[PDB]
Design an enzyme around this catalytic site. Sequence first.
Site, mmCIF file in Angstrom:
data_model
loop_
_atom_site.group_PDB
_atom_site.id
_atom_site.type_symbol
_atom_site.label_atom_id
_atom_site.label_comp_id
_atom_site.label_asym_id
_atom_site.label_seq_id
_atom_site.Cartn_x
_atom_site.Cartn_y
_atom_site.Cartn_z
ATOM 1 N N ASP A 189 37.366 16.666 74.042
ATOM 2 C CA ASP A 189 38.727 16.454 73.566
ATOM 3 C C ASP A 189 39.616 17.597 74.038
ATOM 4 O O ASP A 189 39.406 18.752 73.658
ATOM 5 C CB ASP A 189 38.734 16.350 72.043
ATOM 6 C CG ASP A 189 39.961 15.638 71.506
ATOM 7 O OD1 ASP A 189 40.151 14.450 71.830
ATOM 8 O OD2 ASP A 189 40.725 16.260 70.742
ATOM 9 N N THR A 223 45.064 13.568 75.386
ATOM 10 C CA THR A 223 45.434 14.966 75.203
ATOM 11 C C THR A 223 45.294 15.760 76.496
ATOM 12 O O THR A 223 46.054 16.705 76.734
ATOM 13 C CB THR A 223 44.589 15.590 74.095
ATOM 14 O OG1 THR A 223 43.213 15.586 74.487
ATOM 15 C CG2 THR A 223 44.739 14.795 72.815
ATOM 16 N N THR A 224 44.314 15.418 77.335
ATOM 17 C CA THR A 224 44.203 16.071 78.635
ATOM 18 C C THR A 224 45.226 15.539 79.628
ATOM 19 O O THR A 224 45.625 16.262 80.550
ATOM 20 C CB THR A 224 42.800 15.890 79.211
ATOM 21 O OG1 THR A 224 42.672 14.565 79.733
ATOM 22 C CG2 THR A 224 41.753 16.099 78.143
ATOM 23 N N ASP A 260 39.302 9.748 67.616
ATOM 24 C CA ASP A 260 40.114 9.273 68.734
ATOM 25 C C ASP A 260 40.170 7.751 68.763
ATOM 26 O O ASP A 260 41.241 7.160 68.953
ATOM 27 C CB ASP A 260 39.559 9.805 70.056
ATOM 28 C CG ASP A 260 40.043 11.205 70.376
ATOM 29 O OD1 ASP A 260 40.881 11.742 69.621
ATOM 30 O OD2 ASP A 260 39.590 11.768 71.393
HETATM 31 N N1 LIG Z 1 36.149 2.610 82.833
HETATM 32 C C1 LIG Z 1 37.184 3.293 83.374
HETATM 33 N N2 LIG Z 1 37.544 3.111 84.662
HETATM 34 C C2 LIG Z 1 38.571 3.783 85.211
HETATM 35 N N3 LIG Z 1 39.317 4.676 84.541
HETATM 36 C C3 LIG Z 1 39.072 4.953 83.241
HETATM 37 C C4 LIG Z 1 37.964 4.260 82.570
HETATM 38 N N4 LIG Z 1 37.933 4.718 81.307
HETATM 39 C C5 LIG Z 1 38.935 5.623 81.178
HETATM 40 N N5 LIG Z 1 39.611 5.767 82.332
HETATM 41 C C6 LIG Z 1 40.766 6.667 82.560
HETATM 42 O O1 LIG Z 1 40.424 8.019 82.261
HETATM 43 C C7 LIG Z 1 41.577 8.694 81.756
HETATM 44 C C8 LIG Z 1 41.181 9.750 80.731
HETATM 45 O O2 LIG Z 1 40.472 9.156 79.649
HETATM 46 P P1 LIG Z 1 39.582 10.060 78.659
HETATM 47 O O3 LIG Z 1 39.198 11.325 79.383
HETATM 48 O O4 LIG Z 1 38.489 9.179 78.109
HETATM 49 O O5 LIG Z 1 40.546 10.437 77.427
HETATM 50 P P2 LIG Z 1 41.950 11.201 77.602
HETATM 51 O O6 LIG Z 1 42.915 10.120 78.017
HETATM 52 O O7 LIG Z 1 42.192 11.775 76.230
HETATM 53 O O8 LIG Z 1 41.686 12.232 78.668
HETATM 54 C C9 LIG Z 1 42.485 7.626 81.172
HETATM 55 O O9 LIG Z 1 43.808 7.788 81.688
HETATM 56 C C10 LIG Z 1 41.918 6.303 81.641
HETATM 57 O O10 LIG Z 1 42.915 5.572 82.356
#
Ligand SMILES: Nc1ncnc2c1ncn2[C@@H]1O[C@H](COP(=O)(O)OP(=O)(O)O)[C@@H](O)[C@H]1O
Lengths: 50, 532, 300, 520, 525
Positions: E62, E95-96, E393
Amino acid sequence: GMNKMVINHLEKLFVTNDAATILRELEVQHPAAKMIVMASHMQEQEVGDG
Amino acid sequence: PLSVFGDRSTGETIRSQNVMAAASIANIVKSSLGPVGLDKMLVDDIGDVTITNDGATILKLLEVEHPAAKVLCELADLQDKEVGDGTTSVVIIAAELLKNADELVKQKIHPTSVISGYRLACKEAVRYINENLIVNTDELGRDCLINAAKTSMSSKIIGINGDFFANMVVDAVLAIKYTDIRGQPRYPVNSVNILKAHGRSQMESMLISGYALNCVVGSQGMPKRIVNAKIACLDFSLQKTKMKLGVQVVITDPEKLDQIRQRESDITKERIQKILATGANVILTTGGIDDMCLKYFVEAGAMAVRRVLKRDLKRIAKASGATILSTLANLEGEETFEAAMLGQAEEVVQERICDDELILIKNTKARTSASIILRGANDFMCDEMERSLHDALCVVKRVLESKSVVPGGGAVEAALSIYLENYATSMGSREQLAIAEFARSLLVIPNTLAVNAAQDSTDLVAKLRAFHNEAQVNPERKNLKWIGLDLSNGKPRDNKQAGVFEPTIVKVKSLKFATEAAITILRIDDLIKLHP
Amino acid sequence: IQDGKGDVTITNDGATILKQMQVLHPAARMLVELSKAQDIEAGDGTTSVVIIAGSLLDSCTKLLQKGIHPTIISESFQKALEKGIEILTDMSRPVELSDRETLLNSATTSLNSKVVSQYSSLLSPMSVNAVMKVIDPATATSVDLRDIKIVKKLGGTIDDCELVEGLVLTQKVSNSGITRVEKAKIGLIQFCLSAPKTDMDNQIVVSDYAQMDRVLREERAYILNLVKQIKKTGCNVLLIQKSILRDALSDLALHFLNKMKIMVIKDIEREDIEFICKTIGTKPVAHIDQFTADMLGSAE
Amino acid sequence: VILLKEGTDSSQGIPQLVSNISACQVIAEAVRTTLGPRGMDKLIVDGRGKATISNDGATILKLLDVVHPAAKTLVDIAKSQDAEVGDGTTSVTLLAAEFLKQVKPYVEEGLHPQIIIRAFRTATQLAVNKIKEIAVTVKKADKVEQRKLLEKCAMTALSSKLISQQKAFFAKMVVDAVMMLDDLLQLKMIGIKKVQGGALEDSQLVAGVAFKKTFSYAGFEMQPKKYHNPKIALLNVELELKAEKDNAEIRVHTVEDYQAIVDAEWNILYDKLEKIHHSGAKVVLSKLPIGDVATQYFADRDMFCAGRVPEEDLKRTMMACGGSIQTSVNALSADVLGRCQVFEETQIGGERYNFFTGCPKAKTCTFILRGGAEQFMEETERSLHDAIMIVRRAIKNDSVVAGGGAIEMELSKYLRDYSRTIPGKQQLLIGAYAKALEIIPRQLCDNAGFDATNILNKLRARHAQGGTWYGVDINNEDIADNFEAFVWEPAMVRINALTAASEAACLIVSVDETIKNPRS
Amino acid sequence: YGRPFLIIKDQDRKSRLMGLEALKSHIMAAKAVANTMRTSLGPNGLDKMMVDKDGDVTVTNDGATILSMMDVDHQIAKLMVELSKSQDDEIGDGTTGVVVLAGALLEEAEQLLDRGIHPIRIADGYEQAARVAIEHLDKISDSVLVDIKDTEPLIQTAKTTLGSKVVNSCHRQMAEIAVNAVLTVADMERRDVDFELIKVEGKVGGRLEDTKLIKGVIVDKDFSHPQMPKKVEDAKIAILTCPFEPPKPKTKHKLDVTSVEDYKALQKYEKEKFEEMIQQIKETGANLAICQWGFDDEANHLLLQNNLPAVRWVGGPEIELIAIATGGRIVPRFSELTAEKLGFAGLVQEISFGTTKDKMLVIEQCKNSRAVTIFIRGGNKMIIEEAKRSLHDALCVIRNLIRDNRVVYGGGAAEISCALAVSQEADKCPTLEQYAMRAFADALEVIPMALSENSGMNPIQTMTEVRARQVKEMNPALGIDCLHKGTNDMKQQHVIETLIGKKQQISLATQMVRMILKIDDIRKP
Ligand SMILES: Nc1ncnc2c1ncn2[C@@H]1O[C@H](COP(=O)(O)OP(=O)(O)O)[C@@H](O)[C@H]1O
Ligand SMILES: Nc1ncnc2c1ncn2[C@@H]1O[C@H](COP(=O)(O)OP(=O)(O)O)[C@@H](O)[C@H]1O
Ligand SMILES: Nc1ncnc2c1ncn2[C@@H]1O[C@H](COP(=O)(O)OP(=O)(O)O)[C@@H](O)[C@H]1O
Ligand SMILES: [Mg+2]
Ligand SMILES: [Mg+2]
Ligand SMILES: [Mg+2]
Ligand SMILES: [Mg+2]
Ligand SMILES: [Mg+2]
């Protein structure tokens, strides 16, 4: 008469040309000068000027 | 960011710092300007105290660390060397116009434009000085010299007696005339030896015709007065002849020893008689003289002076016609001395002074010479008079070399400023601003003059020193252009009436040097102070 | 720039700024070496080359961030440079000598970004005349700056700079009796005008009283012989090389030279002999027997 | 023996005054780069590590630790200008420093301080009179034009802040918060509540009253969070088990009396709660804490409780709903309980906020302003306070004047024309005053990265005879009619800035000597 | 003058950075923070192992939590931390993303201001591009159905959110429990979700598969006087506040026993008080008693021999949750305990958690229970903490979707589409301000680049190819194939981001970068 600025022992600014005030808020250590200070302060207390 | 291991100051910070340093130096030197300026006292760490007024000495004695102020100190030293008078003026002008230029820059005016404006303004100011502000010192003689010397002395300790001092000055300078290109006179000052004595009052300083050597008779036996002086200048010491480093004697049979020992002295003896064979009665030598040669001189009746410096001995040889000799050797292989290379002087006398005695050489035959002995209350007083007299001698030298003077008392700078404002009216670029500011900086010296005499400057410079407006716009009113401030009543008076003139060299050199130093110090955009 | 000791400099040349500033990063040191190499090769642009290098490195940082191998970036930069050299060659126009106008234009352009810019009208024509008076403008293919001696002395103003076709010495005349010479015959000297002394150990032994007189007279006669041989060739100004282990000038020797109405210049550096010979056309002498007027320099 | 105590440091004469002037410019340089729409921002780190970010002269000068008495005078003038009109704190500091800078050349030589002080006094009196006689007043007393005037003044106030891009969104907003205030314009009647999270345009103006969830006990989250026509019981009594008098002593000797007294404490609490409930009120508020027993009592009867509310929020609820705080419970009448259109507890950025909205006759307001960082919302609150203060001052008289350096140039031209008839030295000093008053457009151009000299010359040429109201148009990089460009300022800010700057300049000049004691 | 004057107290040690150098330092610190946060982005990202001053360690992904525990001293880094925490507060996801977007925007701003452009102009361009991006994002979004009958889109969104976190080991039951908990707790009429009714509780041991959703209340207590039965069937409960002790007034009091008869009367009063207490507990008919403030031995034994199990020392919030779940009312005195004031319990059971002495109670409801409880089990404390923050989350995403109902197809597709809209708008814009717009486009488009780089693919070529695909066929749901399943189309892969989450990301990052660009001068001791 130009105003004079004095920083007292507590670091408080006094800008003024009133002789009694600058004389009171300025530390004097000489005895004769203390005599004159006392005379001027008594004059201020008795009349308010001079 | 940068890995320099130092300190970095960039932009407005370093510019303001340089301006502050220049202003600090100017403020140190400013109070000692003008006839009403009072001189400063400079005391060392160990107590060596001096009293002085000239800017060059003050700045040299001061310890300065900021390079932007070291530049101004070196500027003052250069002005002292090339001219001699106007050392405070150049520093004041340079610092003031640097401040004005920084004020211009603070409003986002590129410093290249202000530098070009100053450079052109200096050209036009020099042109104006050379064209519309010079009076030839040819229809006026023997009086312009006195007036220039007096106005150079006015700010000094000897100003009160200027009418007495100035006189001998020109006389000294009139006894130094020399010819180099066979038709161009020259006045080699530093050939008038100045001696310090701390006895009687100032009014009894001595102007000696002929040199005044600061030496003493070698031994009390020989006489201390020669009626007709046959001076024998020598660059050759008189002691027993140690053979040489390479040559060393070796004695095999004992009998041959004692003889050479007599030779070890006799050689010297012989030379002495040769020097004494030509009627010589005064002996001057740079090298030392041992006891035996002094005995020869006293027995003969001549005086010997040893450890005479090189410069004074050369001056004596030139003045008396004597030929300085490194050795006694002719174009043949035998040592000899000639009577044709003996100097002749009317008198040589060891005269007593406050506590000591010094040798006076009077009326050398070849060419007229001069020397000055300054009497003062104490050593500080005497050296201050020496410095002031040196300044006056330089001023008279400059006046005679270039027969042209300009009015003093801030007349030239006021005229320059009021003409240069209208000059900078043209050239409608931003550059003109710089030139106009230059003009205002030229006002720094008149105002401070009125400041130093307990008067108000801008209360009068608005109109009283604005007669140059009519002197400029009206050609018929040109007689007012020679007007400067007077401190007896703080009024604009015709300097020609009072005689305050200065050689144009001082003004021209001061302006050029000040503007160039300001240009050099103003190109700075940032500073990198490396750690030691 | 002010270094550790209290010495300051007002520098606009990039090579000097970078050298005086003691950097600590390896990239900075490589950049300062680049600047000095560019100064050596060309002499102008030592700021622009550093600016270009730093700027395109800052450009390539995002290429690194974009997922590109450094070798690809390096090869592509090489290809871009290859194209750019041809672009610059096409953009140019031929320039040929004896066209003083374009030479003055280039000199003024080089001097515009310096403090002496306002003096460039009185400083660029002499700057190009210096080069045009050293090398032949027909078949040169290179010039040397070693034989352009820049002599600096404090005092005056910039408008007092001068270009002299002759020779300038910071040395001082030993005999303060002679100052000017018209129709000068200059002769360099590489030996010593003093008492004789062999290379190996030298010693004189005296055993009688007449021997002191003999040695003094003989030394005086030897010096006078040397000075007479120097004078009989018509030489009127003498240049003595700065010699150590043997006094170049003796007081008696200087006295004799002054007696025969000559001007003497002593203490001349060894490395300056080539410069003096190339300037005034004289040839050095290391033996008195070879001192002849046939190989004696002359000047007006 | 020496006259004064050891370590006393005294400075006299011209150099002391020049050093004071230089200190004034140095301290005014710290806030110089924070003018106009292109104004920058200042970050000040305290000794505790907390960083405050702002671009108003008063806050920056206060945060700076000043020990120079002349710089102290500059700090005081900035703070007093903040306390009088609210807007124009940087202008007073810059004007004072520029007066001193313009006159220091004249003080370098022997100029008596009294004459330059008199010149300042005359120049500032004429300047204030000109500002009074130039500012235009609509004199129509119509609501639409008054609203437009207040909106434009607020918009001009929001420029040069962090809320620039949202001027129109906030400006009219604060106007409403001043529209719904009584004829006293108390600043405590509009609250500002800062909550993390959300965009800058997510801020809102609650016309009733909103405040953060104070506290809760075991029994909360059971009473409903939505009432459609409730009555608010504003209270000042704690509803919980406690000692009757904090010194009351109970003395009994029988168990029956003991049980009777326990039941008596419970009975008095329940009778107080029964009075509150029978008053007809549905949601209750109290400055003093509400115990868990009262929380459960109100939960069992669909009543909302909220204890330990702040004093200011309770008074704002009074002014919104229209009730009155009762310390006593025996007299819950029907005309003392305030009523609101809607009560609702909602979720805002990780916090719970109670809202009383829809009050028909509201004399209060609440600002729920959003942001990303605590300093972001604090700077937004500072800008909003500036705007509400300027609207509060302008509501008393709608006399306006063009900004963007137009008024400074107009006064400069007026003083330049006037300082030709006056003969003597005072002409030069009044001209220096006018050249000093010429600083604001130059600094605006410098902060906007313009050619300051060119724009100033264009302003002077177009403004000597081509018409007043012409200031600097930053977007067009040029000069423009700032009154027709709707850059309006109340004339009182310029009047106060000029008079304060004159007073501070006179106080600084009128010093000839300073003394520092050994500060025992 | 020569004298150097002092104006600021202790001014010989204070430091000041002014002009463009200060902005360079700000941009550099922001770039460092963004580079730190870049690696842990997307499903292929890697966790970070933060240790606090006490030495205790936590492994987390997170971004808000990572930056909050980042003990940092630079003021710009503090502003970035506040940015991340605020984005967590308002949305709970991405958040990132805000940190990475702010870092990219500040880097582009540095590149722009190297060319002598005013920082305020850059901020204005960023604001205009943010407006364009938000408008395009609202135009591109489609809606899902928030209903119990067809809950599958909620599972899809929660499963997309739970990606890139360790709880993706299960990745299906976590989304189910999150959706069910939020749906049960949520007040659909007001569209409000209360997080105080979801008592996320964790305990070590077991496996991550054991994390269940009790439609009731779990409490970390045990039946007092262990002789009583360890479980009861569907029982009537009496939530209680007053302790099972003889009463005493709050006001200070003295009871003078002046005679032996008074002593006997006091003894009888205490004994009969206990007896009447138990009798009036029993008369209501409740099988289970729950007390907040605990009680003594006699109450224990009387409760035991009357076949009425009970527990004590239940906390305030736990009491409230129990009473909400069972439907009863909290009563503060025994004399007002009626039949209507009891609650219902489907079953109350005691669980022992293996060989450890710890015990817990579970209360399961056969009726509508507005409260729930997520119980987490795992093999590490770090796993438990990461699991509970990941489920928080997921719950935040689900409630955001309840209150907004609109979604966009993430995985980089939203950012690429917004970048194309920004660039297309910047095409038909007068110069001197399109540079900021294009810088904004590139800065927001770095997110697919970081996603692909974390996925192992070549960033620039893959990003260019997917952008070309998006512009050729008008399918703005093409994103980085981070999981390597082919099908650049992100509809089939079922990736869902919330519209408010992305628009909040863009707006918040734009406002933070505007503030950072606004700062000019720094004065710090
Ligand atoms: N299965 C997936 N395939 C492609 N992109 C993904 C997938 N799951 C999440 N993402 C992308 O990863 C990014 C970061 O998600 P995550 O690190 O899980 O949480 P956060 O958005 O808090 O960083 C998001 O902008 C999302 O669009
Ligand atoms: N008698 C006089 N009347 C008016 N002005 C004078 C008089 N004497 C000197 N001055 C002015 O006062 C100034 C004094 O300069 P001074 O300080 O002596 O030069 P330096 O800097 O070389 O010491 C000169 O510029 C001169 O113009
Ligand atoms: N839109 C605008 N265009 C030009 N100038 C403006 C504009 N808005 C404000 N100004 C100028 O900014 C100055 C005030 O700057 P600001 O920082 O907002 O308040 P303060 O006076 O407290 O510094 C005023 O003198 C005004 O002339
Ligand atoms: Mg009085
Ligand atoms: Mg003088
Ligand atoms: Mg070049
Ligand atoms: Mg303002
Ligand atoms: Mg996420």
